[PDB]
Design a protein around this ligand. Structure first.
Ligand code: CYC
Ligand code: CYC
Lengths: 183, 183
């Protein structure tokens, strides 16, 4: 009978509960908006895992440049002078990725991605109590889950402070979204 | 300048993160769908707190009958024979709320709400580790967060098993949504 129609909404209802409740769906929609908003050729979420590993877990590329999605690496060491900047919740404006001495090893990554300038925006976690790893601060009582990055690839773009300011605002909004959705 | 327009999306982006991430927004949208789907005059989420208190925290009434929203009570004791049924994850079909001996005290509540029949659907929580209260089972390793109820008010409605079956499916979907969103 039309008991058929009862489930045509139950599958909807479940579909939304699962949709909204999974982290990637809202990661994937924020980045698709950061991209269309800042008119930037690529938006990635570089995720850092405390064992050392790290991976671009979401990405929104203009079709012109490579899918750095899933791009990854193990035992990721960042320059101390840079994590300080990042634990303080401060974005990082890299107006010339090419001569950026802190990213002087992501030359492979830089040239395939074809990145000219970029803004890097920490995603932080107030993780109190007990957890220790590679991306964690005791001075700041905060953990660095990953990084929202935005890639100027077509031109060496110059960034206004409000651009970084803004990306950081959005990053700091993900931070809250992610702390909830980790099971 | 048009730096104005940068924030007209940031307020959107934040608006969605906050929207999706707060429990009530998805409680309120499920019930508005359970209601429009089962053609039932009222849909409530009766929430049970372990101190004893309990309250109708969301509701979707047809404009014809009272807002039992926020309707509440303290030191709520349910008949043991009934929690067993509920911890097992089994909905309860009450085809005549009026002569339901287990709800023989919600006569005030029944007559204002004007409830003729109803389906009652437990919302359960696999709460392991350490927490004990009034709504918690050791036999079933499960806690009873609240109850999704559906109220036939216009007529003493008869319910097909699939109707209860279905409401329970939806209840069991909330259970997963709520376990995530408690901070
Ligand atoms: C070189 C000095 C070291 C380093 C720099 C560094 N990397 C990031 C962020 C990223 N790291 C990667 C991935 C890689 N790390 C690697 O060491 C390698 C192999 C060479 C790879 C492929 C990626 C993809 C990023 C994100 C880059 C992006 O802009 O999307 C940073 C932080 C961000 C910044 O630009 O400030 C830094 C400083 N990381 C190391 O592990 C090296 C010892
Ligand atoms: C009487 C035997 C006892 C009781 C029955 C009972 N209540 C519910 C669920 C609800 N309880 C309330 C609120 C009240 N509980 C009260 O004791 C009072 C005062 C009389 C109120 C106002 C509400 C609103 C509900 C939800 C009812 C609904 O259908 O929306 C149940 C569970 C659900 C069912 O119908 O099986 C039961 C068995 N609760 C008690 O605390 C009494 C000792």
């Amino acid at each position: 009978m039309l008991q058929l129609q009862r489930q045509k909404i139950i599958q909807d209802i479940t579909q939304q509960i699962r949709s909204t409740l999974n982290v990637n769906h809202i990661l994937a929609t924020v980045t698709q908006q950061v991209k269309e908003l800042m008119q930037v050729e690529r938006v990635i979420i570089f995720r850092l895992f405390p064992n050392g590993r790290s991976q671009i877990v979401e990405e929104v590329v203009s079709s012109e440049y490579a899918a750095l999605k899933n791009y990854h690496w193990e035992d990721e060491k960042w320059s101390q002078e840079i994590l300080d900047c990042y634990w303080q919740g401060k974005p990082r404006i890299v107006p010339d990725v090419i001569n950026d001495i802190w990213t002087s090893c992501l030359v492979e990554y830089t040239t395939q991605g074809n990145i000219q300038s970029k803004i890097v925006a920490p995603i932080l976690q107030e993780l109190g109590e007990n957890e220790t790893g590679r991306w964690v601060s005791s001075e700041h009582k905060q953990k660095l889950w990953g990084v929202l990055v935005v890639h100027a690839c077509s031109t060496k773009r110059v960034w206004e402070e409000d651009e970084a300011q803004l990306l950081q605002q959005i990053a700091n909004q993900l931070a809250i979204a992610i702390q909830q959705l980790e099971h």
